[PDB]
Amino acid sequence: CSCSSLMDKECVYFCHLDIIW
Amino acid sequence: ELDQLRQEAEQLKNQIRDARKACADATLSQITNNIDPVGRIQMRTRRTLRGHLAKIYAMHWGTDSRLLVSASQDGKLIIWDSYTTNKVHAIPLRSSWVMTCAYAPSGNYVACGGLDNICSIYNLKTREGNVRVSRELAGHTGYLSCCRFLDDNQIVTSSGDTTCALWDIETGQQTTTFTGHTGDVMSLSLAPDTRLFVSGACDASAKLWDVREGMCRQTFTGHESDINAICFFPNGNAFATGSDDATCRLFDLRADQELMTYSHDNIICGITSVSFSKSGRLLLAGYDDFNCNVWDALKADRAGVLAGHDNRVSCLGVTDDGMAVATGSWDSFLKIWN
Amino acid sequence: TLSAEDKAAVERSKMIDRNLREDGEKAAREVKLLLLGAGESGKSTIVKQMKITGIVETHFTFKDLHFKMFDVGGQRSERKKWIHCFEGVTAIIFCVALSDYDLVNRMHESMKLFDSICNNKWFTDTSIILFLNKKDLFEEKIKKSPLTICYPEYAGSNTYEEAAAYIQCQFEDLNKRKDTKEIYTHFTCATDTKNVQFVFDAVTDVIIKNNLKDCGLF
Amino acid sequence: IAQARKLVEQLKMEANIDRIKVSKAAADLMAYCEAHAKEDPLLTPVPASENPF
Amino acid sequence: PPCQGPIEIKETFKYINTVVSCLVFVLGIIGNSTLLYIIYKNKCMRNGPNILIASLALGDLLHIVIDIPINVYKLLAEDWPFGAEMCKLVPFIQKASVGITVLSLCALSIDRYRAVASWSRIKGIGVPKWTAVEIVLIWVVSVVLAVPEAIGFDIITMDYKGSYLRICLLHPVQKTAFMQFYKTAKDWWLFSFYFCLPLAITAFFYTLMTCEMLNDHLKQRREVAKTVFCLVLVFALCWLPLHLSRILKLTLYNQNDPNRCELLSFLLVLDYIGINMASLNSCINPIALYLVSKRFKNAFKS
Amino acid sequence: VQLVESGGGLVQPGGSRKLSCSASGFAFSSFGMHWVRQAPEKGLEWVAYISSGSGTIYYADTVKGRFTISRDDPKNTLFLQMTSLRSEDTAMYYCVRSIYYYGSSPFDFWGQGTTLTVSSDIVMTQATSSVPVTPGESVSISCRSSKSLLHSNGNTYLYWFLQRPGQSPQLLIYRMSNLASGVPDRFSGSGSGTAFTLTISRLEAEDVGVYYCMQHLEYPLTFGAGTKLEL
């Protein structure tokens, strides 16, 4: 899991839903 | 006429049997109950010799109780230091098929025999510092069972010729020939006084011989299969054998009979190498089922199991000092148990 | 710790161990063959082809692999007490003469010996190499002799090819296992090294099979 | 036929032997076993001071 | 651009994945444990391939043990209540485990190719000469390549629109520029090194072995050729999904897609299946040993 | 068996020379080798040691770096090469074989010896250096050390040597108790750490010479002062 920004409420949601990888 | 000879022979055999039975009055089991048993014995491993890359077929201790010779089917026999596990020497063999390896009491010579019907003696203490073959005792007409050193000039070998031979190291021909056994012999032992020796063959019978004269004085029977190992009691008045019946029968010299058999229903495989202790209260037996057992040489009961090997134990030896025991198996491994 | 002499002894032991490992490596890249057979079963000619008191070790080579053979049947001794020594042999060569099918029941004794060595507990995995010698004289004698004499329960055309095939199949069927043990047959083709080439190829095949089994792909 | 002669002579030679009573031998074996019992490193375990290992 | 945001995991998928993962994990651990026991009992068949198989089993068991429990518990709490050290350590361990697994498969392929391609040192039972070099090289290279994640992930807590986060993510912002360059297209290196290189080398060497391979002899040649290639195909099928999901969420993800939410949800499910299938491949190799060789077959018959 | 050394001659101070030793009659590879220096008047001094197969090399502190050695097993040859020779190196050099296993007797044989002319240690102490003797008289030779020579393994790594006037010395007793092969039984030795002795009973001819006690507990191998017999 990873994101581009600290403002994207969706990618952080995906990471919270992502697996440890 | 010949039938008369057969009848006379069987009548004499029956007379011997009934004389032995008359002299048989009691058993060792009914009296060993009086003396307490040892109980449980544990032999923790101390040293393991990781030098061979093929199954070994014979091993023997030295009189110094520190050096031991191990012979493996790899064609090279190795001398080992018990204390430091150092390969003193590794003598190559002219033929990889080796069945026996003997160590002289003086330690300057080492005997080793194989399937060539030839027991070769190598000389250790040499001016040149290299271990070269001293002598070959050929002319045995049959595979070799085991050779044993009497002196630095006397050695007794046991062949597949169903015979035993007292050779002469310096000369090269057998001074004394011992025969009479029906089947081929497979093991041999020397009494501590070195005046009499026994032999065991496939006849399921063990016969002892007069070293000085050269003929057997008596024979003992009762076994069911071939004899693969014989060990003499340290007192020199008794012994125990070993067969593929898993029965370690015990016989006496002066009593000229069998005291007790050592048979248990747990093990059914063969007996490969038998040994005694310095005291003689206990004996060790290496069977074909990958583990060595230690029975009570007087109480006739299983006193423990040495199961440190993953394959059949071809041989085992007990130090004449009585300190440790070496077990050598077909997994190319010698293990030291104290 | 250890004294200087102890260190010297340890170094000497390590050197001898290196020597032992090198020798075991040299002997490991080497194929062991157990040659045996009945009286005058062609072994004399077999060693005649494969060269240019108890253990007659035939030593020779090929394009590679430095084959070694151990004749043990020439000497007359016991049956099944030294046989376990040859455990771990790469392959076993069986030499049976076809001209002994009439002389006496000898074929029956040969079959019994073959069954003995085939279902032997120690030789569970080692394949078997058969050899049928005097095949031409065998053809002449079966031209001059009937075929039911060898096997009362067997009847058929008295032709060389069918008889050879039948005897080969009869020998092959004697095994009690097929998955691990394989039987490789030959006909003793002339006196040329074609027999040597055949045994080399069979050794290669069995080496590959055993190596795959060790690798777990077989 | 001579083998029968040899075997019968050997057997009769083995017949005339002055053997001893079994219980005597058993008692002697027990006495020898107990005499050297206390000096057996395997029968009687040794403290780790005389241990060569 | 805000979406509707129905981004969640269905209850039924969670319920089925729980039992699927439990079964796969149990089967993998028991198979690898008995493989280790049998390998240890194989001192008569202790060889280079044997050591390689043991290493593969150990790495596989470690991989399953580290991966499955936390990932599946994430379906329960989806909060990561564990501390910073575990948060930064787990992904590094799982990556190193995947690396050792794939390199062990490669070593198996090269050894089982040289088995018929290098029939010169035809024999030798024990520890070979330079296989010990290869296994240790694999062990060190795994961590050498998996280290950046040990410094990549970090816990940061955002005030989500309805909750407070506990995200253990590869931080978009970090100090080391090499880390930013690593994380910009990390999925590319992951896919390449962990799938394409091992699959390429394994297929290459097995095809070479089959070429060198060609009565019952040829039938067995064909059977073994089918076995190794089927093993390779199973590995490829089971290890496509994870890399494919990472790539799809990497490059096909857009910044102004109203539907992407649904898209992302699908990826989520796919990701789960992938790791499950990953562990499935983890458990596949031991069974292949049972269903091919009578030796390990009777060993399992214990 | 024989060791023949050569390559010795007069050179200039600060020069270089290499001496070669050829051995025959025995397995050259199985024996470690040692070089020893006998001063023109003084006793022996160990120079260097080469292990079997060149696995280990030891140099005496006085000749480290300046001296070097090698062995060529296939032709049973040893090489001792030195440069920058000092005026103090003028002496006689001997090459000695030694094999180390349990019950072995190193220093078994000695080289002929080559003269040379140029224009921490466990010291061994001998109380006297000259004692008059007559045939048929038992004589004890004592020798002390700076430290106990009994190791924890039970061995006492001490050796005794006799050098008759004119030729190379030979080993008398090894490990202070065991007689070597070919030496008469009249000799014996005893003692304990840092104080040992050797007894000669019923002395006869050809037994007159210089007697040295040498230690092998650790390197370097120091010798005794040397006790000479007089008639």
Numbering used by the authors:
A (entry chain L): 1 to 21
B (entry chain B): 3 to 340
C (entry chain A): 4 to 55, 182 to 233, 241 to 354
D (entry chain C): 9 to 61
E (entry chain R): 88 to 301, 312 to 399
F (entry chain D): 2 to 120, 124 to 235
Sentences from the study reporting this entry:
Endothelin type B receptor (ETBR) plays a crucial role in regulating blood pressure and humoral homeostasis, making it an important therapeutic target for related diseases. ETBR activation by the endogenous peptide hormones endothelin (ET)−1–3 stimulates several signaling pathways, including Gs, Gi/o, Gq/11, G12/13, and β-arrestin. In this study, we present the cryo-EM structure of the ETBR–Gi complex, complemented by MD simulations and functional studies. These investigations reveal an unusual movement of TM7 to the intracellular side during ETBR activation and the essential roles of the diverse NPxxL motif in stabilizing the active conformation of ETBR and organizing the assembly of the binding pocket for the α5 helix of Gi protein.
